[PDB]
């Protein structure tokens with residue numbers, strides 16, 4: 218039987234998997250996506266600067282190292298599987314059940330689900346390669362950059378309609394492309410419907426993206442198939458993250474008022490043996506950063522080790538002098554593999 | 556007036572400087588060492604694996620990346636200066652004083668001193684280069700690896716004397732070199748002194764490391780100057796950390812202290828005095844680990860909390876770098892020129 222089941226294969230679950238492996242714990246890692254990476258799979262070409270110790274480079278470059286790290290100790294990885302229920306039969310005996318009816322047993326459970334199911338949209342770039350695009354945005358934080366710009370937003374989700382309203386305050390025009398039939402979310406539209414500079418284009422998708430910036434967008438109607446090319450200055454692809462729509466409403470934990478797992482000072486949850494790491498947990502030391510997802514992962518692995526084996530050391534051995542790496546260290550130095 | 560004064564140039568102080576710069580804060584970074592890096596300067600050649608997202612590579616390589624990161628926004632760096640006093644005159648008005656009498660003013664103070672003054676011993680390696688050495692150790696965790704080896708330990712601190720006893724259980728012989736007459740504490744020496752395979756060599760220093768791995772050590776007697784060459788299989792240089800001997804016991808501002816001489820963190824890097832924040836190994840909160848990974852996440856939180864202290868109406872957290880406008884000009888060059 219596996220020592221710990223980690224729910225979520227994002228940076229927090231990946232690092233949690235690594236650090237649990239460093240402490241000689243058996244790990245099962247489950248993620249709903251077809252590939253590991255979590256939210257990092259949404260913005261692969263964007264350059265990340267705020268990860269500690271990592272010189273700026275594409276997210277997809279950093280992700281390859283981070284995935285490898287999560288798998289140093291080679292855990293049992295289960296992709297394309299969606300957890301739907303968590304059960305505590307007894308102390309050090311948990312059942313994790315998927316939607317397909319698969320039941321996995323573990324002595325502890327680490328919940329690293331971020332904000333819920335992530336399903337990155339597959340963008341098709343023509344003329345240029347996606348990796349050199351600069352004016353392609355997957356999140357809006359500062360929006361002063363959109364002054365007098367023609368902005369395209371893909372998706373009719375609540376988040377996309379909220380973005381559209383914020384951007385409309387200073388943008389010249391906003392076009393919201395989505396398919397379905399009519400928008401998702403009543404409240405976002407009542408706010409949005411009074412933005413007289415927002416054009417709604419239902420049943421329409423972004424087809425192709427046409428130096429170092431997107432210059433034109435081919436939009437295409439889902440039914441007729443008619444295409445027309447519109448020039449834009451910035452493109453924003455939403456995905457629709459909505460906390461409060463996770464598995465955590467129907468499992469049987471104390472919840473923060475914003476639908477984050479309430480962390481009791483750290484990654485400790487309201488059930489001994491269940492620990493939450495990453496964006497999903499709230500404690501006073503949390504940041505919405507990859508750096509915090511990592512430090513959360515370590516704490517969840519540490520607390521789970523001492524949960525399974527109370528007399529074990531509180532923390533793991535520093536890797537610089539850890540005996541398991543000694544064989545590899547000689548090869549790295551002799552061959553200059555860095 | 557400086558926005559924030561950061562005391563300590565380790566990974567926690569380095570990241571805090573960077574993230575404070577990301578939040579458009581003026582930064583002063585002060586450190587007593589002659590080079591930035593803190594504890595990372597003790598084990599430069601050692602391979603570090605447990606830092607998130609970083610493929611294993613030499614500590615000195617990761618340190619180079621971390622220093623560069625701390626200096627993107629080019630803060631005011633004060634090296635070879637040892638802070639001795641912290642004073643809070645009023646809100647958004649702090650005085651940071653060094654031993655030379657220099658007084659630096661800041662609206663907030665970030666304490667990133669780790670465990671206190673770090674002073675790496677300068678090893679002189681002859682025959683080999685230090686960076687490809689494997690049997691040179693700065694910490695002992697697992698000690699089964701020393702089975703039937705001739706081991707040298709430099710330093711007479713409690714930790715070094717503890718290592719010697721533990722290592723002595725299975726090693727062929729242990730030699731403990733140090734310079735003090737007693738190196739303080741009867742019992743650690745008394746435990747070790749009855750390990751009949753341990754040779755205590757007081758008033759003795761390491762002079763030369765002679766060698767992939769070190770094969771022999773040139774030892775020199777202090778005062779007399781006598782040298783003798785001894786072959787060893789492993790060399791362990793201890794440093795002696797004591798969290799109870801920092802400036803925080805004798806300053807003009809009393810933060811609440813944890814019972815282990817760590818700053819009491821009120822859930823995170825918040826301290827008992829608004830405007831003073833502790834990040835890194837120095838602070839205690841329930842989410843702490845004694846890892847470089849935790850020093851980074853502490854630094855971010857400390858930069859965030861200082862920002863909302865100086866500007867209450869500022870955003871609680873900083874903009875994610877992937878979409879942060881300050882990097883956009885550089886991003887095109889990095890992308891266009893494939894600078895990665």
Ligand SMILES: Cc1cc2nc3c(=O)[nH]c(=O)nc-3n(C[C@H](O)[C@H](O)[C@H](O)COP(=O)(O)OP(=O)(O)OC[C@H]3O[C@@H](n4cnc5c(N)ncnc54)[C@H](O)[C@@H]3O)c2cc1C
Pocket residue numbers: 224225226227228229230247248249250253254255256257259260264265266267268298299300301329330331332333334335336355356464494495496497505506507508510875876877878
């Ligand atoms: C656009 C964007 C840019 C960012 N840029 C930065 C940056 O530059 N620097 C930085 O420090 N931080 C950044 N962040 C912060 C971000 O939170 C982290 O990068 C990272 O996503 C942390 O997520 P996580 O570890 O909680 O896991 P996540 O990335 O949230 O992934 C969780 C994983 O669990 C899976 N999952 C969810 N529910 C279930 C379920 N029920 N069953 C099974 N699997 C499930 C998901 O599909 C996913 O694979 C950014 C965030 C976004 C959205």
Ligand SMILES: Cc1cc2nc3c(=O)[nH]c(=O)nc-3n(C[C@H](O)[C@H](O)[C@H](O)COP(=O)(O)OP(=O)(O)OC[C@H]3O[C@@H](n4cnc5c(N)ncnc54)[C@H](O)[C@@H]3O)c2cc1C
Pocket residue numbers: 535536537538562563564565566567568585586587588592593594595597598603604605606636637638639667668669670671672673674693694802834835836837845846847848850
């Ligand atoms: C894989 C791994 C291996 C590790 N191996 C080791 C190891 O072998 N040995 C070890 O000791 N740690 C080791 N660590 C711990 C790690 O190096 C530290 O946790 C890290 O350096 C934390 O940095 P910090 O800035 O919080 O503290 P520090 O690195 O100690 O930073 C303190 C800095 O502030 C300065 N300073 C202190 N007081 C003052 C003052 N009054 N005025 C001015 N400057 C001052 C110090 O000189 C120093 O530059 C390891 C960690 C990991 C993850």
